[PDB]
Design a binder for this molecule. Structure first.
Ligand SMILES: [Zn+2]
Length: 31
């Protein structure tokens, strides 16, 4: 719940769980 933002791509979701995984799914893509 509540609008959450994955500013590292720009996609925003209200999912606290999906965000938590999404941000982690971001910081691994780097070298
Ligand atoms: Zn993202």
């Amino acid at each position: 719940m509540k609008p959450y933002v994955c500013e590292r791509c720009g996609k925003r979701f209200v999912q606290s769980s999906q965000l938590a995984n999404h941000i982690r799914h971001h910081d691994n893509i780097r070298p």
